[PDB]
């Protein structure tokens, strides 16, 4: 279980690494995925060995860049149908009004 | 040999990782050491393996 605070992530990952858990499933609002991935990097774990999975259905949202050359696999799940033209159009339109926040 | 700019580092480190060169000596004014180490990190080239 992830402890209460996000930045307490350290021991848990540390135990996982010591125990040599070479697969992981997550389940949490991607907002938690950000914290857990930053730890998973700074703890020197993003190596093509480990191979995460996410059930949080918004994996696409995360900034995949600073991890992408490392070589881990982050199979996820997305439903918002980016494939269709009109869907993407409406995404963009809503985006042009989304950024007022 | 490191190329002209530092951020150019990526191909070289790619070769080091591919051939599995598990040790290194560097040499640079540390200002180069910083960028080369950052690349060393984001390349998945910074673990308890290497030294």
Curated annotation (Swiss-Prot), chain A:
It comes from the Eukaryota. It is found in: Cell membrane; Postsynaptic cell membrane. Sumoylation mediates kainate receptor-mediated endocytosis and regulates synaptic transmission. Sumoylation is enhanced by PIAS3 and desumoylated by SENP1. Glycans are attached at residue 73. Highest expression is found in the olfactory lobe, piriform cortex, dentate gyrus, hippocampus, granular cell layer of the cerebellum, and in caudate-putamen. The postsynaptic actions of Glu are mediated by a variety of receptors that are named according to their selective agonists. This receptor binds domoate > kainate > quisqualate > glutamate. It does not bind AMPA without coexpression with GRIK5. Homotetramer and heterotetramer with GRIK5. Tetramers may be formed by the dimerization of dimers. Assembles into a kainate-gated homomeric channel that does not bind AMPA. Can form functional heteromeric receptors with GRIK4 and GRIK5. Can form functional heteromeric receptors with GRIK3. Interacts with DLG4. Interacts with NETO2. Interacts (via C-terminus) with KLHL17 (via kelch repeats); the interaction targets GRIK2 for degradation via ubiquitin-proteasome pathway. Belongs to the glutamate-gated ion channel (TC 1.A.10.1) family. GRIK2 subfamily. Ionotropic glutamate receptor that functions as a cation-permeable ligand-gated ion channel, gated by L-glutamate and the glutamatergic agonist kainic acid. L-glutamate acts as an excitatory neurotransmitter at many synapses in the central nervous system. Binding of the excitatory neurotransmitter L-glutamate induces a conformation change, leading to the opening of the cation channel, and thereby converts the chemical signal to an electrical impulse. The receptor then desensitizes rapidly and enters a transient inactive state, characterized by the presence of bound agonist. Independent of its ionotropic glutamate receptor activity, acts as a thermoreceptor conferring sensitivity to cold temperatures. Functions in dorsal root ganglion neurons. This is Glutamate receptor ionotropic, kainate 2. The gene is Grik2.
């Amino acid at each position: 279980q992830l402890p209460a605070d996000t930045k307490d992530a350290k021991p848990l990952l540390k135990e996982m690494k010591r125990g040599k858990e070479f697969h992981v499933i997550f389940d949490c609002s991607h907002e938690m995925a950000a914290g857990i991935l930053k730890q998973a990097l700074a703890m020197g774990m993003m190596t093509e060995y480990y191979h995460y999975i996410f059930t949080t259905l918004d994996l696409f949202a995360l900034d995949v860049e600073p991890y992408r050359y490392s070589g881990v696999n982050m199979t996820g799940f997305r439903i918002l149908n980016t494939e269709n033209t009109q869907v993407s159009s409406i995404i963009e339109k809503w985006s042009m009004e989304r950024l007022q926040a």
